[PDB]
Enzyme design. Structure first.
Site, PDB file in Angstrom:
ATOM      1  N   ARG A   1       4.013 -12.862   1.182  1.00  0.00           N
ATOM      2  CA  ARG A   1       4.442 -12.006   2.281  1.00  0.00           C
ATOM      3  C   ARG A   1       5.793 -12.490   2.815  1.00  0.00           C
ATOM      4  O   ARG A   1       6.663 -11.686   3.154  1.00  0.00           O
ATOM      5  CB  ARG A   1       3.391 -12.015   3.400  1.00  0.00           C
TER       6      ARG A   1
ATOM      7  N   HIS B   1       9.059 -10.233   3.098  1.00  0.00           N
ATOM      8  CA  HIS B   1       9.702  -9.959   4.380  1.00  0.00           C
ATOM      9  C   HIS B   1      11.138 -10.450   4.478  1.00  0.00           C
ATOM     10  O   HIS B   1      11.953  -9.851   5.180  1.00  0.00           O
ATOM     11  CB  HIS B   1       8.881 -10.527   5.539  1.00  0.00           C
TER      12      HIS B   1
ATOM     13  N   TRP C   1      -8.492  -6.995   1.787  1.00  0.00           N
ATOM     14  CA  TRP C   1      -8.490  -5.777   0.979  1.00  0.00           C
ATOM     15  C   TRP C   1      -9.509  -5.893  -0.151  1.00  0.00           C
ATOM     16  O   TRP C   1      -9.903  -4.894  -0.748  1.00  0.00           O
ATOM     17  CB  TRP C   1      -7.108  -5.538   0.362  1.00  0.00           C
TER      18      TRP C   1
END
Ligand code: FMI
EC number: 1.11.1.5
Length: 294
Positions: free
Chosen positions: A48, A52, A191
């Site tokens: 991540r 980002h 998820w």
């Protein structure tokens, strides 16, 4: 104000072996600090972080992007969209201390590559050369996407990062990793089941789970399944939009195809905005610790 050009410049005298050492240090720490986030490990957050720090890019003027490693500056560090990434930055601190010669951009991006590979994902070719830029080059907050939108928003947003339908669907597959944390994003839950193993589970879950649109404790809507999984409104939009749906089905039925497409899209994402000289080194493909017997 003219669109500046960021030319990759190899860290003085460094070569493949030097970066493999950084990769190894990152991989070894991923193995050591295994307790993080209820034993999920730092793999997901490093991915991540890589995304980002790269996703702020704007193809229109080449601002933002992975080149400058501007996440090290307060403005970007405190972007609400980056809440929680401080854990990834802290993880990389000892790495940067041992290898002070690597640029911040190269380290942030390499962290993502290392994480994907160590979590048994596809090999991600990686190129060095990102150079730290001044604090005034830090992009303003608000360039990263929202998760409470629909397919049209997703498609339009990613055009700014020069990504097409297949690239977007492939990149989102990384959501098979880690989880949403209410405190960081206003969403809660994983998820899937393989939180720290890179597979095409994201697509299988979208298609096979029985999803219900509910409101979490932050009063935000998200899709939940009795299995204990969740999907963001943007994740779910991938099966609502007919074009995205076709691609989701393709990846759910071809693990190798997903790995190959994700590899290309992820490298592209991490290289957006960078100009590589004709005589720059070819992309590096690092061996995993397992492949090295380490
Ligand atoms: C490179 C792949 C990738 C892409 C392209 C991509 C794209 C997009 N992501 Fe995603 N992501 C990745 C990888 C990737 N993500 C990973 C690995 C995580 C888990 C982080 C962790 O577990 O700490 C997370 C976690 C996460 C979370 C939970 C954050 C938290 O609460 O900690 C949210 C809300 C979102 C929203 C969005 C979008 C939809 C809005 C910005 C989006 O467009 N993400």
């Amino acid at each position: 104000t003219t669109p500046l050009v960021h030319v990759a410049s190899v860290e003085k005298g460094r070569s493949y072996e030097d970066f493999q050492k950084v990769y190894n240090a990152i991989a070894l720490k991923l193995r050591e600090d295994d307790e993080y986030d209820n034993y999920i490990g730092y793999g997901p957050v490093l991915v991540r972080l890589a995304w980002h720090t790269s996703g702020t890019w704007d193809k229109h003027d080449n601002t933002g992007g992975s080149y400058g490693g501007t996440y090290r500056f307060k403005k970007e560090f405190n972007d609400p969209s980056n809440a929680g990434l401080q854990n990834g930055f802290k993880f990389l601190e000892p790495i940067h201390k041992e290898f002070p010669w690597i640029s911040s951009g190269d380290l942030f991006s390499l962290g993502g590559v290392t994480a994907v590979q160590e979590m048994q994902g596809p090999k991600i070719p990686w190129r060095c050369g990102r150079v730290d830029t001044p604090e005034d080059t830090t992009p303003d907050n608000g360039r990263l996407p929202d998760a409470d939108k629909d397919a049209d928003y997703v498609r339009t947003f990613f055009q700014r990062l020069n990504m097409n339908d297949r690239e977007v669907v492939a990149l989102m597959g990384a959501h098979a990793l880690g989880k949403t944390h209410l405190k960081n994003s206003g969403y809660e839950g994983p998820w899937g089941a393989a939180n720290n193993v890179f597979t095409n589970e994201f697509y299988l879950n979208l298609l096979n789970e029985d999803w219900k649109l509910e409101k979490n404790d932050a009063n935000n809507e998200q899709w939940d399944s009795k299995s204990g999984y969740m999907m963001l409104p943007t994740d779910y939009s991938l099966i609502q939009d007919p074009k995205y749906l076709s691609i989701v089905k393709e990846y759910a039925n071809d693990q190798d195809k997903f790995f190959k497409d994700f590899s290309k899209a992820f490298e592209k994402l991490l290289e957006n905005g960078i100009t590589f000289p004709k005589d720059a080194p070819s992309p590096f493909i690092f061996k995993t610790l397992e492949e090295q017997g380490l």
